[PDB]
Symmetry: C3
Subunit: 259 residues, 3 copies
């Protein structure tokens, strides 16, 4: 399609013919960019970047930049894996992984607003949003349809479950459970992400089954272990609820408590 004459693209970089690269953009070697991707002006794509189809990179976005980890050996070919249909706004910055078997990974249809940051070794699934100036520390994992507000600190090694929301001015130290909204410092689960769930087309029955799972877990005067047991012993559960139980069971750091 069109690479501006002022763009600096390493000859070894692999770009589909349709790829558009704007003025004063820099693309390094060991880069692959797939069909339909548009790179605007002053964008930098660093060595190790593997980018899918129909992605947009707005002015000044920087992709696959060195980890902000002082002990990292800068000589290593580490990677940034990006899927399809993602939007990287102005001056957003995605950092590569710290090990050869540990890329920074982004799936599909994610939206990274202006000046948002994804730290080394983060794994994000699909359809997530980081709002303006949002920062994700290294080693943070997002599922799908998660929402990260600006002015949020997430502790390394935390997981954020599907359809969850972290509101602004929050400090996250343990996992954010799916379908939930976390707020405050120190942060707590304050309720369900009803908007995300309605917007997603969850049926009233599905939303009420999610509400019922968390009533047992949080609002029944019993320990988390006791509550998960109660839920499993109650019969056939829907997938969303099985997922809730499994998220709690699989938690490394433990799961954020309820207000």
């Amino acid at each position: 399609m069109k690479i501006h004459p002022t763009a600096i693209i390493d000859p070894k970089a692999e770009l589909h013919e349709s790829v558009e690269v704007g003025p004063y953009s820099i693309i390094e070697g060991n880069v692959s960019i797939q069909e339909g991707t548009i790179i605007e002006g002053h964008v930098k794509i660093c060595a190790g970047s593997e980018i899918g189809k129909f992605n947009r990179f707005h002015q000044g976005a920087v992709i696959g930049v060195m980890p902000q980890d002082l002990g990292f050996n800068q000589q290593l070919l580490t990677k940034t894996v990006i899927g399809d249909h993602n939007i990287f706004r102005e001056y957003s910055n995605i950092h590569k992984g710290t090990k050869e078997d540990s890329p920074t990974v982004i799936g599909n249809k994610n939206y990274f607003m202006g000046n948002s940051h994804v730290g080394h070794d983060c794994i994000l699934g699909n359809n997530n949003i980081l709002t303006h100036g949002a920062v994700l520390a290294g080693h943070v994992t997002l599922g799908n349809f998660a929402f990260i507000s600006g002015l949020v600190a997430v502790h390394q090694f935390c997981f954020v479950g599907d359809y969850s929301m972290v509101a602004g001015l929050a400090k996250v130290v343990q996992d954010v459970p799916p379908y939930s909204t976390v707020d405050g410092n120190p942060s707590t689960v304050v309720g369900l992400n009803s908007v995300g769930m309605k917007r997603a087309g969850f049926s009233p029955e599905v939303r009420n089954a999610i509400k019922h799972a968390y009533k047992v877990i949080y609002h029944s005067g019993i320990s988390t272990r006791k509550a998960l047991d109660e839920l499993e012993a109650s019969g056939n559960l829907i997938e969303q609820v099985k997922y809730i139980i499994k998220f709690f069971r699989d938690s490394d750091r433990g799961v954020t408590n309820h207000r």
Copy 2:
């Protein structure tokens, strides 16, 4: 005056002869820039930008960029209206409106510090300051001489009154009343912006009349409705106080409570 040879300026863009544009800056079509305006390096001015006189745009500032709204039709010619004598610091980012009859609007002599952000459909008057990294969400309205600190979240559709201040680490959910200082999360009016008022040359009588209006509204053990009534029934009021009453009366979301 001087457009650097490396600047990329659409032939349809309307620039007064005196306009200075620095190295590697991009100016699109449907742009008008008036006398005395200086654009530094790596600045981007997007289609729909209408810029007045004696404005300064520092390195990497981006003006009229797409709204960060997923439902917005990117095909529309929407606008960013900027008046005179404004300063846009390094990597500040001003987003255009979402409708043809709904520009993002900035008046005169405003100061946008490094990496500050103005969301789609914001309206700002004159002489406002957003400090370093300050973010205004879409649909936020500032009057004149308002002060927005970094680490502040303002809810969409909030109004910030004249000479008011929002201190750092604050979450604003209802209107910020004029001549006042708002702080905390959840935020409250904590007192009057006495510095802004003194700096502005408000007489002791004017400042005391403002203090007296808020004593009735906040510190008299009555409802807001009762208090505004009391004030109007008390005789001839100065303009500043009439404005206070009207601000409370005209509030869409309601006005932030007092600590």
Copy 3:
């Protein structure tokens, strides 16, 4: 070594032969850059910048930019003094001083993460870290090995002592004492920076002597003045403890209280 043909370097600027300057970077006059320094792409180095050896400036870093102070006379040749082995990440921004005898000063081996900001007239010593999006207001002083988290506001004229840490979502209004960790809004000393101290190779005896100094100062039911007196009257103290006492004695704004 290599200055890219597209770099714009004022002929009066003094660069050691080994200095590497990347694509579309701007270096102004009244600049001096010493041996081993690498400047990446789109970097701006402003007049008054005096840079030492083996510094790295990542893409879009801006150095010696005008103070964000409205009363500052932009005609003055004010300075930014940077030592050796510092790292300035992507879109970090260092502002120059406001007086001819008042530079912004950075020592050695400091790390400024992406989009971090150093205000006019800050003085930083050696080995400090500002994390992603960290902002230091004008006139803030850091010693050595201090750690500044993102989402922190530090009041002008505050000192941050050696090996201290300010955690995220904190508002600093008085001095941060050495070897300590400050947290919250309003902020308090919450404990000792044991990690910084262990990482630094402080002996168990040295760390326990520091803990003992603060037990007297904070946890003995007496005033700060009384406590410092008690410590000095207790005999021969190690340097780290003498420093603690002196930091408290020399405090302009006073020192942050303990939780």
